[PDB]
């Protein structure tokens, strides 16, 4: 086990990967945008809070501040090319609203093909270093029945995993319940 | 796609799983404790910030408040049972420090057998509903060389994945860079 003192940004900050990327959908007037966020996480069960950490550099950043509502959608391995594409181009240069999607009960756009998605109302934004954490309260839930097991989890092997710097994967079929 | 409006806590809050659990290691004098946390995420690259979301119900919670420094260690599928064990018992009733570990440069405890670990200095704590987010600055990094690839990512198939409610998995060894 090699070790070193941190002296600035790490030569790679990928030790806690892979993670599932959340597709953040935001609408301001007629303009819709999508942005994968691999820095995401549950923050509370009661009430249900979910967090995404978005750089001020993203076009999505300014949209979320304005809209104060967004979606977070979770997508099968099969949609990795679409997910990658949405994370390698900016709403500033291309209209991501053309990606097939529907609007939710609260009118946040949700990218199609998702096994599950949340609609969120923005509760708080906190700056931590060079990204902002958007804390959302889950106000509605979407699920694709025959892609989710009983307790709410996606069928093993289904989840798109992200390893960092453009590399994707998926979980194995084999699960262990000790 | 079935939907419903959230009416309180979700029947299951697992739609965004699986994730890598971070084993949080903390020391207050002689007392060492370890707690897995699947609610974890990078928060900034410059400077490198890493967050874990810990319930005030955990013995680990008061230990973090006191010590203000912790480790987040990341473990191979191999150690699923030690991880589960540490996640099913409380330091209130069993001395978790008897699990094989070493102290790091800053004197935080790190659980042995990890492919990587961070040593963190606590910067802020934020209450989001029923959990507190502990934001740590990475002050040191440990890596078991060669178990990571060249960019810092753990070799495919190695990561312990958690699906929630005592179910674990691992990534498939097939990756795609689209
Ligand atoms: C798999 C993946 C995960 C990503 N996760 C994040 C993240 O957590 N935070 C972030 O600020 N950017 C993240 N990005 C980068 C943004 O998605 C990317 O900059 C995107 O093109 C932003 O689009 P926008 O400018 O339309 O918002 C990610 C990109 C990819 C491909
Ligand atoms: C895989 C796994 C992930 C967990 N993630 C979290 C988490 O993110 N936050 C939390 O408060 N508890 C989490 N727990 C529960 C604690 O790890 C568990 O309550 C543990 O016994 C705490 O022990 P302590 O009382 O010694 O702190 C998790 C448990 C498991 C098994
Ligand atoms: O802002 C980003 C955070 C994490 C990533 O993996 C990519 C971009
Ligand atoms: O406090 C907890 C958060 C998430 C989990 O999956 C388990 C415990």
Short mmCIF file of C-alpha atoms and ligand atoms in Angstrom, two decimals:
data_model
loop_
_atom_site.label_atom_id
_atom_site.label_comp_id
_atom_site.label_asym_id
_atom_site.label_seq_id
_atom_site.Cartn_x
_atom_site.Cartn_y
_atom_site.Cartn_z
CA UNK A 1 0.00 0.00 0.00
CA UNK A 2 1.62 3.20 -1.34
CA UNK A 3 0.57 6.51 0.24
CA UNK A 4 1.14 10.25 -0.14
CA UNK A 5 0.17 13.63 1.34
CA UNK A 6 -2.40 15.61 -0.71
CA UNK A 7 -0.68 18.62 -2.29
CA UNK A 8 -3.54 19.97 -4.41
CA UNK A 9 -6.03 18.20 -6.67
CA UNK A 10 -5.38 14.46 -6.78
CA UNK A 11 -3.74 12.97 -9.89
CA UNK A 12 -7.02 11.03 -10.12
CA UNK A 13 -10.00 11.26 -7.83
CA UNK A 14 -11.62 7.98 -8.83
CA UNK A 15 -10.99 5.68 -5.82
CA UNK A 16 -14.68 5.56 -4.77
CA UNK A 17 -15.94 4.81 -8.27
CA UNK A 18 -17.82 3.25 -10.01
CA UNK A 19 -21.10 4.99 -9.26
CA UNK A 20 -24.48 5.21 -11.02
CA UNK A 21 -24.78 8.53 -12.87
CA UNK A 22 -27.94 10.52 -12.21
CA UNK A 23 -29.32 12.20 -15.29
CA UNK A 24 -30.34 15.71 -14.13
CA UNK A 25 -33.16 17.16 -16.28
CA UNK A 26 -34.08 20.86 -15.95
CA UNK A 27 -36.61 23.09 -17.80
CA UNK A 28 -36.66 26.89 -17.91
CA UNK A 29 -39.60 28.11 -20.03
CA UNK A 30 -39.36 25.99 -23.20
CA UNK A 31 -35.64 25.25 -22.83
CA UNK A 32 -34.89 21.70 -21.61
CA UNK A 33 -31.37 20.45 -20.62
CA UNK A 34 -29.87 17.16 -19.45
CA UNK A 35 -26.62 16.59 -17.56
CA UNK A 36 -25.27 13.37 -16.06
CA UNK A 37 -24.02 13.71 -12.50
CA UNK A 38 -21.97 10.86 -11.01
CA UNK A 39 -21.51 12.84 -7.80
CA UNK A 40 -24.93 12.12 -6.43
CA UNK A 41 -26.22 10.44 -3.27
CA UNK A 42 -29.12 9.96 -0.88
CA UNK A 43 -29.08 12.54 1.90
CA UNK A 44 -32.16 11.64 3.96
CA UNK A 45 -34.90 8.97 4.12
CA UNK A 46 -37.49 11.05 6.00
CA UNK A 47 -38.01 13.39 4.34
CA UNK A 48 -36.49 11.84 1.19
CA UNK A 49 -33.61 14.10 0.04
CA UNK A 50 -31.37 13.39 -2.88
CA UNK A 51 -28.19 15.27 -3.76
CA UNK A 52 -26.34 16.11 -6.96
CA UNK A 53 -23.06 17.99 -7.12
CA UNK A 54 -22.80 20.22 -10.20
CA UNK A 55 -19.96 22.50 -11.32
CA UNK A 56 -20.76 26.23 -11.78
CA UNK A 57 -19.16 25.66 -15.24
CA UNK A 58 -22.18 23.61 -16.44
CA UNK A 59 -25.02 25.31 -18.36
CA UNK A 60 -27.25 23.12 -16.11
CA UNK A 61 -25.95 24.92 -13.03
CA UNK A 62 -27.64 28.29 -13.93
CA UNK A 63 -30.79 26.50 -15.08
CA UNK A 64 -31.31 24.73 -11.73
CA UNK A 65 -30.92 28.00 -9.82
CA UNK A 66 -33.57 29.61 -12.03
CA UNK A 67 -36.01 26.65 -12.20
CA UNK A 68 -35.63 25.44 -8.56
CA UNK A 69 -37.00 22.04 -9.72
CA UNK A 70 -35.31 19.20 -11.56
CA UNK A 71 -35.43 15.48 -12.29
CA UNK A 72 -32.84 12.79 -11.59
CA UNK A 73 -33.22 9.69 -13.82
CA UNK A 74 -31.41 6.39 -13.77
CA UNK A 75 -30.75 4.54 -16.96
CA UNK A 76 -30.01 0.96 -18.14
CA UNK A 77 -26.58 -0.05 -19.41
CA UNK A 78 -28.18 -0.04 -22.87
CA UNK A 79 -28.38 3.75 -22.89
CA UNK A 80 -24.70 4.41 -22.14
CA UNK A 81 -24.03 6.12 -25.50
CA UNK A 82 -26.85 8.58 -24.96
CA UNK A 83 -25.72 9.17 -21.36
CA UNK A 84 -22.14 9.73 -22.49
CA UNK A 85 -23.23 12.09 -25.23
CA UNK A 86 -25.22 14.23 -22.81
CA UNK A 87 -22.14 14.44 -20.60
CA UNK A 88 -19.71 15.40 -23.36
CA UNK A 89 -21.67 18.25 -24.88
CA UNK A 90 -23.03 21.49 -23.42
CA UNK A 91 -26.56 23.00 -23.67
CA UNK A 92 -24.61 26.16 -24.59
CA UNK A 93 -23.64 24.58 -27.93
CA UNK A 94 -26.35 21.99 -28.67
CA UNK A 95 -30.08 21.58 -27.89
CA UNK A 96 -30.30 18.64 -25.51
CA UNK A 97 -34.09 19.14 -25.38
CA UNK A 98 -34.21 17.04 -28.57
CA UNK A 99 -33.28 13.91 -26.63
CA UNK A 100 -36.55 11.94 -26.22
CA UNK A 101 -38.18 12.75 -22.93
CA UNK A 102 -41.52 13.44 -21.23
CA UNK A 103 -42.59 16.01 -18.65
CA UNK A 104 -43.42 14.89 -15.06
CA UNK A 105 -46.34 15.82 -12.80
CA UNK A 106 -44.37 18.88 -11.64
CA UNK A 107 -43.24 19.64 -15.22
CA UNK A 108 -39.58 18.71 -14.87
CA UNK A 109 -38.32 16.84 -17.96
CA UNK A 110 -37.37 13.22 -17.58
CA UNK A 111 -35.15 11.43 -20.11
CA UNK A 112 -36.85 8.42 -21.66
CA UNK A 113 -35.65 4.84 -21.22
CA UNK A 114 -35.08 5.25 -17.48
CA UNK A 115 -35.85 2.39 -15.15
CA UNK A 116 -36.57 4.99 -12.42
CA UNK A 117 -36.55 8.79 -11.90
CA UNK A 118 -37.32 11.32 -9.19
CA UNK A 119 -38.91 14.69 -9.59
CA UNK A 120 -37.25 17.02 -7.13
CA UNK A 121 -37.99 20.39 -5.59
CA UNK A 122 -34.81 22.29 -4.79
CA UNK A 123 -34.39 22.80 -1.07
CA UNK A 124 -30.83 24.18 -0.74
CA UNK A 125 -27.58 24.72 -2.62
CA UNK A 126 -24.25 24.61 -0.84
CA UNK A 127 -20.83 25.40 -2.25
CA UNK A 128 -18.12 22.87 -1.48
CA UNK A 129 -14.87 23.78 -3.22
CA UNK A 130 -15.34 23.86 -6.97
CA UNK A 131 -18.85 22.23 -7.20
CA UNK A 132 -22.24 23.08 -5.74
CA UNK A 133 -24.41 20.49 -4.00
CA UNK A 134 -28.07 20.73 -5.06
CA UNK A 135 -30.21 19.22 -2.37
CA UNK A 136 -33.61 18.17 -3.69
CA UNK A 137 -36.71 16.82 -1.97
CA UNK A 138 -38.24 13.91 -3.88
CA UNK A 139 -41.80 15.04 -4.70
CA UNK A 140 -42.70 12.28 -7.15
CA UNK A 141 -41.35 8.90 -8.26
CA UNK A 142 -41.36 7.10 -11.61
CA UNK A 143 -40.57 3.40 -12.03
CA UNK A 144 -40.50 0.97 -14.94
CA UNK A 145 -42.22 -2.06 -13.25
CA UNK A 146 -40.48 -5.02 -14.91
CA UNK A 147 -36.99 -3.55 -14.50
CA UNK A 148 -37.21 -3.08 -10.71
CA UNK A 149 -37.30 -5.84 -8.10
CA UNK A 150 -39.67 -5.76 -5.12
CA UNK A 151 -37.71 -3.61 -2.63
CA UNK A 152 -37.19 -0.97 -5.32
CA UNK A 153 -33.71 -1.85 -6.64
CA UNK A 154 -32.95 -2.35 -10.37
CA UNK A 155 -32.63 -5.96 -11.59
CA UNK A 156 -28.98 -7.06 -11.18
CA UNK A 157 -26.84 -6.24 -14.22
CA UNK A 158 -29.25 -3.47 -15.34
CA UNK A 159 -27.53 -0.34 -13.83
CA UNK A 160 -25.22 1.86 -15.88
CA UNK A 161 -22.00 2.22 -13.86
CA UNK A 162 -19.46 4.96 -14.41
CA UNK A 163 -15.77 4.57 -13.68
CA UNK A 164 -14.58 8.09 -14.48
CA UNK A 165 -12.88 9.71 -17.49
CA UNK A 166 -15.25 8.16 -20.06
CA UNK A 167 -15.25 4.50 -18.90
CA UNK A 168 -18.58 2.73 -18.21
CA UNK A 169 -19.58 -0.71 -16.90
CA UNK A 170 -22.46 -2.56 -15.27
CA UNK A 171 -22.96 -4.74 -12.26
CA UNK A 172 -22.48 -8.50 -12.43
CA UNK A 173 -25.54 -10.81 -12.44
CA UNK A 174 -24.32 -12.48 -9.22
CA UNK A 175 -25.51 -10.91 -5.98
CA UNK A 176 -24.72 -12.05 -2.42
CA UNK A 177 -27.03 -11.51 0.58
CA UNK A 178 -25.13 -12.48 3.78
CA UNK B 1 -43.89 3.76 -16.43
CA UNK B 2 -45.75 3.85 -13.10
CA UNK B 3 -45.47 7.02 -11.07
CA UNK B 4 -46.77 8.28 -7.73
CA UNK B 5 -46.45 11.47 -5.66
CA UNK B 6 -44.24 11.21 -2.59
CA UNK B 7 -46.38 11.28 0.56
CA UNK B 8 -43.54 10.87 3.04
CA UNK B 9 -40.62 8.39 3.09
CA UNK B 10 -40.46 6.10 0.07
CA UNK B 11 -41.50 2.41 0.35
CA UNK B 12 -37.91 1.83 -0.77
CA UNK B 13 -35.34 4.52 -1.47
CA UNK B 14 -33.01 2.38 -3.64
CA UNK B 15 -33.61 3.53 -7.25
CA UNK B 16 -30.12 5.09 -7.48
CA UNK B 17 -28.29 2.05 -6.05
CA UNK B 18 -25.94 0.12 -6.30
CA UNK B 19 -23.14 2.20 -4.88
CA UNK B 20 -19.71 1.64 -3.39
CA UNK B 21 -19.82 1.73 0.42
CA UNK B 22 -17.19 3.88 2.06
CA UNK B 23 -15.91 2.34 5.25
CA UNK B 24 -15.65 5.26 7.60
CA UNK B 25 -12.92 4.67 10.22
CA UNK B 26 -12.72 7.01 13.26
CA UNK B 27 -10.53 7.15 16.43
CA UNK B 28 -11.23 8.93 19.72
CA UNK B 29 -8.15 8.22 21.91
CA UNK B 30 -7.84 4.44 22.21
CA UNK B 31 -11.36 3.90 20.90
CA UNK B 32 -11.47 2.93 17.19
CA UNK B 33 -14.80 2.54 15.25
CA UNK B 34 -15.79 1.62 11.66
CA UNK B 35 -19.06 2.29 9.89
CA UNK B 36 -19.92 1.63 6.27
CA UNK B 37 -21.61 4.46 4.40
CA UNK B 38 -23.13 3.99 0.97
CA UNK B 39 -24.37 7.58 0.99
CA UNK B 40 -21.06 9.02 -0.06
CA UNK B 41 -19.83 11.17 -2.95
CA UNK B 42 -17.01 13.36 -4.23
CA UNK B 43 -17.86 17.05 -3.62
CA UNK B 44 -14.95 18.96 -5.19
CA UNK B 45 -11.79 18.15 -7.08
CA UNK B 46 -9.90 21.35 -6.30
CA UNK B 47 -9.56 21.09 -3.38
CA UNK B 48 -10.39 17.37 -3.08
CA UNK B 49 -13.57 17.10 -0.92
CA UNK B 50 -15.34 13.87 -0.06
CA UNK B 51 -18.67 13.59 1.74
CA UNK B 52 -20.35 10.92 3.82
CA UNK B 53 -23.89 11.06 5.11
CA UNK B 54 -24.18 9.56 8.60
CA UNK B 55 -27.28 9.21 10.77
CA UNK B 56 -27.12 10.85 14.29
CA UNK B 57 -28.24 7.39 15.40
CA UNK B 58 -24.84 5.88 14.64
CA UNK B 59 -22.19 5.57 17.35
CA UNK B 60 -19.87 6.77 14.53
CA UNK B 61 -21.72 10.15 14.43
CA UNK B 62 -20.60 11.49 17.85
CA UNK B 63 -17.13 10.05 17.30
CA UNK B 64 -16.74 12.19 14.11
CA UNK B 65 -17.92 15.32 15.88
CA UNK B 66 -15.30 14.75 18.60
CA UNK B 67 -12.33 13.60 16.47
CA UNK B 68 -12.90 15.84 13.39
CA UNK B 69 -10.81 13.44 11.28
CA UNK B 70 -11.70 10.15 9.66
CA UNK B 71 -10.78 7.66 6.97
CA UNK B 72 -12.95 6.52 4.06
CA UNK B 73 -11.67 3.19 2.84
CA UNK B 74 -12.81 1.21 -0.20
CA UNK B 75 -12.82 -2.55 -0.14
CA UNK B 76 -12.82 -5.42 -2.67
CA UNK B 77 -15.80 -7.76 -3.16
CA UNK B 78 -13.64 -10.21 -1.18
CA UNK B 79 -14.47 -8.43 2.08
CA UNK B 80 -18.27 -8.25 1.70
CA UNK B 81 -18.79 -10.12 5.02
CA UNK B 82 -16.52 -7.92 7.11
CA UNK B 83 -18.17 -4.89 5.49
CA UNK B 84 -21.66 -6.28 6.19
CA UNK B 85 -20.62 -7.21 9.73
CA UNK B 86 -19.44 -3.65 10.45
CA UNK B 87 -22.73 -2.41 9.02
CA UNK B 88 -24.92 -4.73 11.15
CA UNK B 89 -23.40 -4.10 14.63
CA UNK B 90 -22.83 -0.98 16.65
CA UNK B 91 -19.67 0.18 18.47
CA UNK B 92 -22.08 0.60 21.41
CA UNK B 93 -22.15 -3.20 21.84
CA UNK B 94 -19.02 -4.58 20.19
CA UNK B 95 -15.50 -3.16 19.88
CA UNK B 96 -15.16 -2.77 16.10
CA UNK B 97 -11.53 -1.65 16.50
CA UNK B 98 -10.55 -5.30 16.82
CA UNK B 99 -11.04 -5.55 13.06
CA UNK B 100 -7.54 -5.54 11.47
CA UNK B 101 -6.53 -1.93 10.77
CA UNK B 102 -3.60 0.51 10.77
CA UNK B 103 -3.29 4.16 11.69
CA UNK B 104 -2.56 6.67 8.89
CA UNK B 105 -0.24 9.68 8.82
CA UNK B 106 -2.86 11.84 10.56
CA UNK B 107 -3.59 9.03 13.06
CA UNK B 108 -7.05 8.14 11.68
CA UNK B 109 -7.68 4.39 11.50
CA UNK B 110 -7.86 2.61 8.19
CA UNK B 111 -9.38 -0.83 7.75
CA UNK B 112 -6.93 -3.35 6.27
CA UNK B 113 -7.47 -4.99 2.88
CA UNK B 114 -8.69 -1.80 1.16
CA UNK B 115 -7.72 -1.14 -2.43
CA UNK B 116 -7.72 2.63 -1.56
CA UNK B 117 -8.37 5.00 1.33
CA UNK B 118 -8.50 8.68 2.08
CA UNK B 119 -7.56 10.40 5.29
CA UNK B 120 -9.83 13.34 5.82
CA UNK B 121 -9.96 16.43 7.97
CA UNK B 122 -13.55 17.40 8.80
CA UNK B 123 -14.50 20.76 7.25
CA UNK B 124 -18.25 21.09 7.76
CA UNK B 125 -21.29 19.17 8.88
CA UNK B 126 -24.71 19.90 7.41
CA UNK B 127 -28.03 18.51 8.54
CA UNK B 128 -30.22 17.36 5.68
CA UNK B 129 -33.38 15.77 7.10
CA UNK B 130 -32.58 12.63 9.05
CA UNK B 131 -28.82 12.44 8.26
CA UNK B 132 -25.78 14.71 8.59
CA UNK B 133 -23.39 15.18 5.71
CA UNK B 134 -19.77 15.23 6.89
CA UNK B 135 -17.63 17.03 4.38
CA UNK B 136 -13.97 16.07 4.64
CA UNK B 137 -10.92 17.47 2.89
CA UNK B 138 -8.65 14.66 1.60
CA UNK B 139 -5.29 15.22 3.28
CA UNK B 140 -3.74 11.84 2.41
CA UNK B 141 -4.28 8.99 -0.08
CA UNK B 142 -3.49 5.23 0.21
CA UNK B 143 -3.53 2.92 -2.79
CA UNK B 144 -2.77 -0.74 -3.17
CA UNK B 145 -0.80 -0.34 -6.42
CA UNK B 146 -1.85 -2.45 -9.39
CA UNK B 147 -5.31 -3.09 -7.91
CA UNK B 148 -6.05 0.30 -9.44
CA UNK B 149 -5.63 0.84 -13.17
CA UNK B 150 -3.35 3.56 -14.49
CA UNK B 151 -5.83 6.45 -14.13
CA UNK B 152 -6.59 5.73 -10.46
CA UNK B 153 -9.75 3.64 -11.04
CA UNK B 154 -10.05 0.22 -9.33
CA UNK B 155 -9.62 -2.70 -11.76
CA UNK B 156 -12.96 -3.81 -13.23
CA UNK B 157 -14.83 -6.42 -11.20
CA UNK B 158 -13.07 -5.58 -7.93
CA UNK B 159 -15.37 -2.97 -6.23
CA UNK B 160 -17.85 -4.10 -3.60
CA UNK B 161 -21.27 -2.85 -4.68
CA UNK B 162 -24.21 -2.42 -2.38
CA UNK B 163 -27.82 -2.65 -3.50
CA UNK B 164 -29.43 -1.82 -0.12
CA UNK B 165 -31.12 -4.00 2.55
CA UNK B 166 -28.20 -6.45 2.97
CA UNK B 167 -27.71 -7.20 -0.77
CA UNK B 168 -24.23 -6.90 -2.34
CA UNK B 169 -22.76 -7.25 -5.81
CA UNK B 170 -19.73 -6.43 -7.91
CA UNK B 171 -19.26 -4.81 -11.27
CA UNK B 172 -18.97 -6.94 -14.42
CA UNK B 173 -15.38 -7.09 -15.77
CA UNK B 174 -16.55 -5.83 -19.18
CA UNK B 175 -16.17 -2.07 -19.55
CA UNK B 176 -17.04 0.26 -22.39
CA UNK B 177 -15.36 3.54 -23.41
CA UNK B 178 -17.78 4.95 -26.02
C1 LIG C 1 -20.76 9.96 -16.68
C2 LIG C 1 -20.62 11.43 -16.38
C3 LIG C 1 -20.84 11.90 -15.06
C4 LIG C 1 -20.73 13.27 -14.77
N1 LIG C 1 -20.93 13.74 -13.50
C5 LIG C 1 -20.84 15.07 -13.24
C6 LIG C 1 -21.05 15.63 -11.90
O1 LIG C 1 -21.32 14.89 -10.92
N2 LIG C 1 -20.95 16.98 -11.76
C7 LIG C 1 -20.65 17.81 -12.79
O2 LIG C 1 -20.55 19.04 -12.59
N3 LIG C 1 -20.42 17.36 -14.05
C8 LIG C 1 -20.51 16.04 -14.32
N4 LIG C 1 -20.30 15.57 -15.63
C9 LIG C 1 -19.97 16.50 -16.70
C10 LIG C 1 -21.22 17.13 -17.27
O3 LIG C 1 -22.20 16.12 -17.49
C11 LIG C 1 -20.78 17.71 -18.60
O4 LIG C 1 -19.90 18.81 -18.35
C12 LIG C 1 -22.02 18.09 -19.41
O5 LIG C 1 -21.64 18.17 -20.79
C13 LIG C 1 -22.67 19.37 -18.89
O6 LIG C 1 -23.69 19.87 -19.78
P1 LIG C 1 -24.33 21.33 -19.63
O7 LIG C 1 -23.17 22.30 -19.85
O8 LIG C 1 -25.44 21.30 -20.69
O9 LIG C 1 -24.87 21.37 -18.20
C14 LIG C 1 -20.40 14.20 -15.90
C15 LIG C 1 -20.18 13.74 -17.21
C16 LIG C 1 -20.29 12.38 -17.49
C17 LIG C 1 -20.07 11.87 -18.90
C1 LIG C 2 -23.74 -1.39 3.13
C2 LIG C 2 -24.17 -0.44 4.22
C3 LIG C 2 -24.18 0.94 3.96
C4 LIG C 2 -24.56 1.83 4.98
N1 LIG C 2 -24.59 3.17 4.75
C5 LIG C 2 -24.93 4.03 5.71
C6 LIG C 2 -24.97 5.49 5.50
O1 LIG C 2 -24.64 5.97 4.39
N2 LIG C 2 -25.33 6.27 6.54
C7 LIG C 2 -25.66 5.80 7.77
O2 LIG C 2 -26.00 6.58 8.71
N3 LIG C 2 -25.66 4.47 8.01
C8 LIG C 2 -25.32 3.57 7.06
N4 LIG C 2 -25.33 2.21 7.32
C9 LIG C 2 -25.72 1.76 8.66
C10 LIG C 2 -24.52 1.77 9.57
O3 LIG C 2 -23.35 1.34 8.87
C11 LIG C 2 -24.88 0.84 10.70
O4 LIG C 2 -25.97 1.45 11.42
C12 LIG C 2 -23.66 0.64 11.59
O5 LIG C 2 -24.01 -0.42 12.45
C13 LIG C 2 -23.28 1.89 12.39
O6 LIG C 2 -22.48 1.45 13.47
P1 LIG C 2 -22.04 2.38 14.71
O7 LIG C 2 -23.24 2.48 15.64
O8 LIG C 2 -20.81 1.62 15.23
O9 LIG C 2 -21.68 3.73 14.13
C14 LIG C 2 -24.94 1.30 6.32
C15 LIG C 2 -24.94 -0.08 6.57
C16 LIG C 2 -24.56 -0.96 5.56
C17 LIG C 2 -24.56 -2.43 5.84
O1 LIG C 3 -17.75 17.57 -12.53
C1 LIG C 3 -17.48 16.23 -12.65
C2 LIG C 3 -17.47 15.44 -11.50
C3 LIG C 3 -17.19 14.09 -11.63
C4 LIG C 3 -16.91 13.51 -12.88
O2 LIG C 3 -16.65 12.15 -12.93
C5 LIG C 3 -16.92 14.30 -14.04
C6 LIG C 3 -17.21 15.66 -13.91
O1 LIG C 4 -28.38 5.31 7.11
C1 LIG C 4 -28.38 4.51 6.02
C2 LIG C 4 -28.40 5.09 4.75
C3 LIG C 4 -28.41 4.25 3.64
C4 LIG C 4 -28.40 2.87 3.77
O2 LIG C 4 -28.42 2.09 2.64
C5 LIG C 4 -28.37 2.29 5.04
C6 LIG C 4 -28.36 3.12 6.16
#
